[PDB]
Amino acid sequence: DKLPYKVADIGLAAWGRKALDIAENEMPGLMRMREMYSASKPLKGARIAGCLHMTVETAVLIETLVALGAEVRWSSCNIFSTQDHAAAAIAKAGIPVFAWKGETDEEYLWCIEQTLHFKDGPLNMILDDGGDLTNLIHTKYPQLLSGIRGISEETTTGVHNLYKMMSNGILKVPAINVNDSVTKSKFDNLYGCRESLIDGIKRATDVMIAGKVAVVAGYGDVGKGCAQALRGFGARVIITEIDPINALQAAMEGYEVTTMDEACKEGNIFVTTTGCVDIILGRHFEQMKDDAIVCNIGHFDVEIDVKWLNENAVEKVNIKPQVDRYWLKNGRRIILLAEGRLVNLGCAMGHPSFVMSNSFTNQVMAQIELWTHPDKYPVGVHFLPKKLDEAVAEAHLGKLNVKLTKLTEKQAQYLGMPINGPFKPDHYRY
Amino acid sequence: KLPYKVADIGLAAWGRKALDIAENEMPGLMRMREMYSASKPLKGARIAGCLHMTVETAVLIETLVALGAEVRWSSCNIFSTQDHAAAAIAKAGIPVFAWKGETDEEYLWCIEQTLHFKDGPLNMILDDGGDLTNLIHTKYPQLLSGIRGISEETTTGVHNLYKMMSNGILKVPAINVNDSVTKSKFDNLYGCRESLIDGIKRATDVMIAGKVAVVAGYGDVGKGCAQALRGFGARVIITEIDPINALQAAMEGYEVTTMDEACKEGNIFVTTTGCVDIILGRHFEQMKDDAIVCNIGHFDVEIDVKWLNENAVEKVNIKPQVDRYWLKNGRRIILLAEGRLVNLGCAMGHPSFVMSNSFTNQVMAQIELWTHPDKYPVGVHFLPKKLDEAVAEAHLGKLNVKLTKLTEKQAQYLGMPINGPFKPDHYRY
Amino acid sequence: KLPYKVADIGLAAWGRKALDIAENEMPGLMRMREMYSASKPLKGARIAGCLHMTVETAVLIETLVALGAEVRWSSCNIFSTQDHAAAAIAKAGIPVFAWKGETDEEYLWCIEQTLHFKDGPLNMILDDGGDLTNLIHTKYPQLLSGIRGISEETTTGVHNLYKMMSNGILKVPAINVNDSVTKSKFDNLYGCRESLIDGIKRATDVMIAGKVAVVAGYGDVGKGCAQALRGFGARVIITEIDPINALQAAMEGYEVTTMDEACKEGNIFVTTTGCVDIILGRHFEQMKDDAIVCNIGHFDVEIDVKWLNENAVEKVNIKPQVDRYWLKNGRRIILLAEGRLVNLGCAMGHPSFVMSNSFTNQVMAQIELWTHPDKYPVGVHFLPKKLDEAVAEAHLGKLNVKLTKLTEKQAQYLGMPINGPFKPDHYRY
Amino acid sequence: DKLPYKVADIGLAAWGRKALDIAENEMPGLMRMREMYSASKPLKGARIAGCLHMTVETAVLIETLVALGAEVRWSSCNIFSTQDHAAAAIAKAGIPVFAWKGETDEEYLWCIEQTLHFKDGPLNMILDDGGDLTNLIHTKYPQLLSGIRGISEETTTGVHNLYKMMSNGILKVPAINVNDSVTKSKFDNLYGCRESLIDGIKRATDVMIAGKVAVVAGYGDVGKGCAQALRGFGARVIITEIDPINALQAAMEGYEVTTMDEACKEGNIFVTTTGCVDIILGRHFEQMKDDAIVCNIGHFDVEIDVKWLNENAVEKVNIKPQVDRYWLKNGRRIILLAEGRLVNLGCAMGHPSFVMSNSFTNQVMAQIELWTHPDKYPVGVHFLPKKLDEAVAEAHLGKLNVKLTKLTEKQAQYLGMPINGPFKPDHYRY
């Protein structure tokens, strides 16, 4: 007596499938997993609950997991990130998915709850992005923990929570930190946001980037990619940071590094990338230039004080979905994107498929590792082996017509490494 | 007679919201309203406009009307109209004949609706690409003597005006707006640097990083497109016929080679030439699987779209203005906007700030032709550099730029007028 | 009369090695030799040259002589001569009067040595900055009627020629070489993009990354300097008087503000304006400790070096052309080349490849004036675009650029001559 | 009866000192070490043999070590890298230094040998760059190993050798890997080469970079900085790589990635950054464009087959010191810089002082750590703690007028980190 799926409109499935066909040909890593593992079904018996943005790219991941033998039930990890045509294609394929663009907060929790119970038992595997599923099970369903073989977690904020849980003795299931595979953190977080930040801002506002001042809070992998994107289109980018290493990197790249208390007086565009609370406050809003555009690309909507705008503005004018223009008591306006939620996924389409193929090949490898080799993974937070990380990159070279050099026997001897790798030590930072 | 024809008048309130936002990004146009709304220099003008019916053009239209003009409008491309912008103009009582996704015959019909006003025929033309200009000269020559001037937006259109003049077939004075410095060095360059990628992303969502992109032409548009693609991590190859532009591209770190070679390597193809026959069947047959092919020159003449329609073995519509073809060789081609301007056809065109430069020039040109026609004999003219500088100066405050003023000692040293113009006529910026 | 005067003739063999290398980077000049060494179009010319006596200028000189000219040379800056290049020219029998580190009076003496040849006075001028031009007009007017033409290298020099003409004091025809497209859009831009940093590094070895650099002026030189500094991770602030150039800089992501504000923030200061009074005592007093201050405009008029010499409390010579001043406020200023052109004074000037563009134009100008004087009445002229294009085309093979040729169908469509010129006279590239 | 120092010309000392005065004001990290530690003399009793490029920056490091109480004896780690005015200033200060520009190979070994014996005993500390000193002691003087408290090693190739020594049981002294402090690897290797590669090429050749094709072998930290530099001046950069991760990074940045076997036919400039043997061979030279410029910026001269040029060219024309133009049997010419030795230090002045202040503040901290806290460092290869790494960056922010943000109490609580750091986990890659 439970719903089999819930999506905005299953009639979008044919359009979704056309988008999936295109994405497949951009995602050689996931397609290679299908080629290598579709016959052997390494994920047979797995019942994976997934809580991850229900986009075209995630649909290609889902269909990969099913091809490898898993049963899957899916929800989005953000109320605005679902792409309804992609959700439709997954629903039409008979895969239980509970996701649509523009969920309420109650609906959001309800969708995760729909993914826990399969025909043959509760979930026995977690694929998570931000830890909402991880936390739901630990807090509300501790009785299911013993039946879960593993967690794989996508994002910086999510893995931060796993490490914290482990340090406080709260984590009861082995986890693989997918965010910090080299082929995820150094590619998705960086090159993904270099494209999808501007895409979100443009689809929402059509604003010219050239000539503006843009303030980016944080200069981690996300902030590095965001700053590069904005600079490339001729914005003058000002960085805020708490970490003196990241701040020196920003300075050495030619950006002004100062505080939000100063930068709020100058910015025309504000982008938060910190994963931290209380980045853009009332005291900042009141000093901004007229029609300042304010958005967040950190995982949770905790960075911008949107409550302050709702409570203090004279009026909120909705321009279109996920775009609101607040009129302040000082007579100036603030353009807020996606209610302070992830702007790339909320206002556009998130990262393009090619780079998501790197992140999602890591996800598939992690599910296989945890499902088929559980002895290797005691309760704790683990990384994929470098040889697998390198395999993810290698799987994407062909599409780009990259010609990789092979070490000669003599060179391999000289370097003291194997011809087939791994080629770097464990601490290597790329 | 219809008061207008648009897709959906119900889009007017959303259109108006977009216009409100755009006004705040278009200080040059708003300054024209501030300066001239009371004196109404365009009183008596009946301007027929043929120019992409976007949010930005709506702000231009309402500026012309604030200055006293009567206006009737059409788009200059069948896919470029933004229906909410057209609806806002219609709702405001201005005759606009435009919608996204016109047939070719509807396109001509819409231009024809702009010719006749209550008081008489058009007496001014505002054109982007020369279609209105050419229509009048070829089909309505009886109206020519009643037209005081033409202002022309785009490189292809001014190219046509010069050709008409050299052949003695131009019959009305024109101002070349494209070649104001504040148009050609801004709109064509920085405009495309943002809107090309916007069109490609909304259509395909393709990653740019890691791709080879081939840009045909390295003029102002090609310079902007190339820079955009390179900034996102594409490896950009350029084609060119002009050895100066080719040397510029090589000096910027781009490989310059022929389309005959580059067709074997590109994952993305962008035509910027203004020229016929740039991407042909012999090129398509050599392209990497799922190569994305698009045009950003004014007319759809650069890519042989007829060839794909005739020779592909499969053709699948992915979504509006996105088609995926399967060739006899088994590989796929993705074609955007049927080879029409991709930025306006698949996205929203250039952002409003840079369009404020172009459209401030347009307002100035219309005022010059309407109020000082004797300064402009039949021929093709530029705006004075003093006005060109004034366009740029009007956009500095929004960006909080602080311009330096020469001292009288410095102005004497330079032999320069202290308020400009600051550069000689041949200066290239 | 001396056959020459140089620092050290013993440097000739090393000079020759540097010339051999430079020739292989200068295909335009070598092509002029290939084409014209036999026909000798400059037979009869007695060219007095006043232009930085560098390796690149040596290749130019030997090209003029291969074409049949007699030549006598001086540098146009007291610090720009490359003594090995001067020695190679001297050793080859060409009268050159130049060395690095001339006094002001030696500088004038050297120019004066170039005026008289065995057969009579100079009959052609090749100038960079107008000093030879001005010397003849002001001090030797009796020689004017014997001079067939002037070709002038640099923006400041052509500025002077236009001023002379407008005032009716220009008495010899001139060709403006600076404003060939293949000069101004290449040498001024890409040349400075490499040689500014070269001068700053050889003088100071300072890290650029992490600094604030202030560039005064955003013309061709300022565009090149700014790009260079930004590429190494400096945060670049721009000053400008021209609202068009200012808007260009803002659209490229640079803060544009006044020197009055920017003096408080810069760690590096580069003047590119061609104008007097850019960096003054009131600016020095506000600068960060050990701010590096340099000029890349033609004349040393931009920085108030007199102020530092008079008001500093300590002045230490660090090495040739590098001085470190201590002000009354306790902070230090590092001044390069006594405010003279830093790229040529502290390094080697622009690299040979881009100078081949400039100097191919120079050879063409000299041939035009010498062999077709009646085409050039007293006044200031440009080379034809066809020749400008030919300069760029002559450099494409070295870079393995493959230029596309229009088809006859495409040329008909465009109304363009199939071999060029490909752009209208007003084109800005 | 041993020489007290040996330098090209001690008369250069006054000029050297002027350069040192300038460098000090660019090196706030080293100056802060002097301010903090000059009175307490933490390095009293230390007798440090240093084998590291005898440049102006190294002179500031040497004077820092002496201010902190150490006795020091110094040699260069490259035959072309010494800056004679800097060596003169150190000699004049009474510090035994044995280094000059243009040493022969016999002289080079002799100089290291001069640094082993102090008035009060043999060396008891090693400061090394490339491991030549480390290897000399282990191979030729094993009897001195027990009296050495620690090794600090500067460069990637040197630390590679330490790890290899440790894995083979050959390492007998505790070492700190300074190369892989974040504030070294991510700054010196990257931003240092972004400036000093081009400086070396230009001082040697004055070649135009714009319009050329440049081939960079390797896309590690050095190759990343080299590629960026060349691209910035308008060269078209082609990358070679053996590591599929680094190669994907290059591709995602817009570079063509192919093999040297292909790229040799196209390049006008070749830069080797690999740390590996046999990168540019005879078969490559014979296919290059005329006047191709060939140089190496990896630590040892093992990357370019210079022997092949000496044996096969028709003639070698010396242009000036460290610049040779070989005429090949095919009639084309090759311009070889610094005999295939480090081009930035051999043909110009190496990295600028500011970034070397980061590397050398790490060196001073490592010497203090090994000298004063030996119990923390058993025989093995160790990293500096992240808190010290962060302290190095923080010490350079003031000079750049960077304003770092401080976390609020509430934010620190939210993130689960201390207000004063460290701010990142141990695996963070920046």
Ligand SMILES: NC(=O)c1ccc[n+]([C@@H]2O[C@H](COP(=O)([O-])OP(=O)(O)OC[C@H]3O[C@@H](n4cnc5c(N)ncnc54)[C@H](O)[C@@H]3O)[C@@H](O)[C@H]2O)c1
């Ligand atoms: N939207 C997306 O597609 C996308 C992609 C990847 C990651 N993420 C999310 O983005 C956020 C950042 O990820 P990351 O990988 O860049 O993490 P990171 O740890 O690499 O970077 C975050 C940076 O924020 C800085 N910071 C923290 N508090 C700050 C403050 N109060 N003011 C200024 N700076 C502060 C930190 O010093 C750190 O350098 C995370 O929430 C992550 O989950 C989003």
Ligand SMILES: NC(=O)c1ccc[n+]([C@@H]2O[C@H](COP(=O)([O-])OP(=O)(O)OC[C@H]3O[C@@H](n4cnc5c(N)ncnc54)[C@H](O)[C@@H]3O)[C@@H](O)[C@H]2O)c1
């Ligand atoms: N879509 C837009 O928003 C937009 C904006 C501005 C201009 N335009 C249009 O874009 C086109 C280009 O404009 P522009 O200002 O760059 O003109 P342009 O004259 O500056 O540049 C076009 C370049 O194409 C090169 N070219 C011509 N034929 C070629 C061929 N067969 N192969 C390779 N190169 C060739 C020319 O040498 C020239 O340098 C025109 O049609 C113009 O009207 C479009």
Ligand SMILES: NC(=O)c1ccc[n+]([C@@H]2O[C@H](COP(=O)([O-])OP(=O)(O)OC[C@H]3O[C@@H](n4cnc5c(N)ncnc54)[C@H](O)[C@@H]3O)[C@@H](O)[C@H]2O)c1
């Ligand atoms: N050192 C070299 O190798 C080299 C090379 C080429 C040109 N030059 C010289 O460099 C100078 C600049 O040449 P250009 O081609 O860039 O000329 P330009 O006219 O293109 O640019 C100079 C810029 O300075 C700006 N300017 C003038 N006075 C100013 C002031 N007081 N404050 C701020 N900006 C001001 C102008 O608006 C102009 O845009 C000239 O002296 C020229 O002869 C030197």
Ligand SMILES: NC(=O)c1ccc[n+]([C@@H]2O[C@H](COP(=O)([O-])OP(=O)(O)OC[C@H]3O[C@@H](n4cnc5c(N)ncnc54)[C@H](O)[C@@H]3O)[C@@H](O)[C@H]2O)c1
């Ligand atoms: N000259 C300097 O001032 C300077 C500065 C720092 C480091 N170094 C030296 O530079 C070299 C590189 O240092 P790094 O920090 O960049 O090391 P790295 O390990 O980060 O980079 C070297 C790269 O070379 C690639 N590589 C190895 N063999 C190759 C081959 N045969 N062909 C193509 N690529 C190959 C590797 O995959 C690796 O990515 C080392 O020798 C280091 O000691 C020099």
Ligand SMILES: Nc1ncnc2c1ncn2[C@@H]1O[C@H](CO)[C@@H](O)[C@H]1O
């Ligand atoms: N198109 C996409 N589909 C699925 N996840 C995405 C997309 N773009 C970004 N993400 C993921 O969103 C996460 C933040 O929740 C990032 O770590 C990133 O990996």
Ligand SMILES: Nc1ncnc2c1ncn2[C@@H]1O[C@H](CO)[C@@H](O)[C@H]1O
């Ligand atoms: N958003 C826009 N609205 C109106 N015209 C535009 C827009 N974007 C680009 N164009 C114009 O389209 C012309 C090509 O037809 C260009 O010359 C440019 O000025």
Ligand SMILES: Nc1ncnc2c1ncn2[C@@H]1O[C@H](CO)[C@@H](O)[C@H]1O
């Ligand atoms: N290496 C060089 N040799 C000769 N002239 C140069 C060099 N570098 C720059 N210049 C010239 O110096 C002029 C300024 O005096 C510039 O116009 C430029 O053409």
Ligand SMILES: Nc1ncnc2c1ncn2[C@@H]1O[C@H](CO)[C@@H](O)[C@H]1O
């Ligand atoms: N100016 C310099 N002085 C001393 N060492 C340097 C300089 N430039 C580069 N290096 C060092 O040379 C090492 C390679 O031997 C690099 O790891 C780098 O830290």
Ligand code: NA
């Ligand atoms: Na997508």
Ligand code: NA
């Ligand atoms: Na718009």
Ligand code: NA
């Ligand atoms: Na030179």
Ligand code: NA
């Ligand atoms: Na130095």
